A paper describes a structure:
In cryo-EM micrographs, WT aSyn fibrils appeared well dispersed facilitating their structural analysis. Two-dimensional (2D) class averaging showed the twisted morphology of these fibrils and revealed two populations of different width. Further 2D classification demonstrated that wide fibrils consisted of two protofilaments (2PF), while narrow fibrils contained only one (1PF). Interestingly, subsequent 3D classification suggested a different fold in 1PF vs 2PF fibrils. 3D reconstruction was successful only for the 2PF polymorph, converging to a map of 2·7 Å resolution, which allowed building an atomic model. This revealed a fold previously observed in recombinant WT aSyn fibrils, where the interface between the protofilaments spans residues 45 to 59 and is stabilized by a salt bridge between lysine 45 (K45) and glutamic acid 57 (E57). In contrast, lateral association of WT fibrils was minimal, and two protofilament fibrils were also abundant. In G14R fibrils, an N-terminal stretch encompassing residues 13 to 20 binds the K45-E57 interface, thereby preventing the formation of the 2PF fibrils observed in WT. Although 3D reconstruction of WT 1 PF fibrils was not successful (see above), comparison of 3D classes between G14R and WT 1 PF fibrils revealed their similarity. Altogether, these data suggest that while WT aSyn is highly polymorphic resulting in at least two stable conformations (1PF, 2PF), the G14R mutation strongly favors the 1PF fold, possibly by blocking the K45-E57 protofilament interface by an N-terminal stretch.
aSyn, encoded by the SNCA gene, is an intrinsically disordered protein abundant in the brain, in red blood cells, and in several other cell types, but its precise function is still unclear. As an IDP, monomeric aSyn exists in a dynamic ensemble of conformations in solution, while cellular aSyn exhibits a dynamic equilibrium between its cytosolic soluble disordered form and helically structured membrane-bound conformations. The aggregation of aSyn into insoluble amyloid fibrils is related to the pathogenesis of different synucleinopathies, albeit in ways that are not fully understood. Several variants of aSyn have been linked to familial forms of PD and include, for example, A53T, V15A, A30G, A30P, E46K, H50Q, G51D, A53E, A53V and T72M, highlighting the importance of aSyn in PD.
Numbering used by the authors:
A (entry chain B), B (entry chain A): 14 to 25, 36 to 94
The structure:
Amino acid sequence: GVVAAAEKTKQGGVLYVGSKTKEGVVHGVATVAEKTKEQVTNVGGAVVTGVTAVAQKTVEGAGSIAAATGF
Amino acid sequence: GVVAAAEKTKQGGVLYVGSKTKEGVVHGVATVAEKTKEQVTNVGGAVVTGVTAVAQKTVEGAGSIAAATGF
């Protein structure tokens, strides 16, 4: 069936961000529906979201997503 | 100067409105500014405002508006 497996076996830079916004509306991962059966959202990584969203070295590993929606 | 005068000396229909809206956003008389000196709004009549705004025989009289904005 639906199987997810992730293995991480580890045997063994200036970033300046400046923002100045008077008004800001930010939407990240958004799923919108009126009539649906399944609305599954799977997050294995990063969904860093904001007016000044900064992501630095977020997803650096074994990630597995298995979805069997429907049937 | 600024003078307003109104005199009303009175010496002596089926209206069916049906509305069906799932979502409604209604704005009537709206004045929007970021930097202004005067923002005067004068109402002598009717500003009937709504999702199902109905006006029937509203302004039937002597109405006077005198505005001396500025100078």
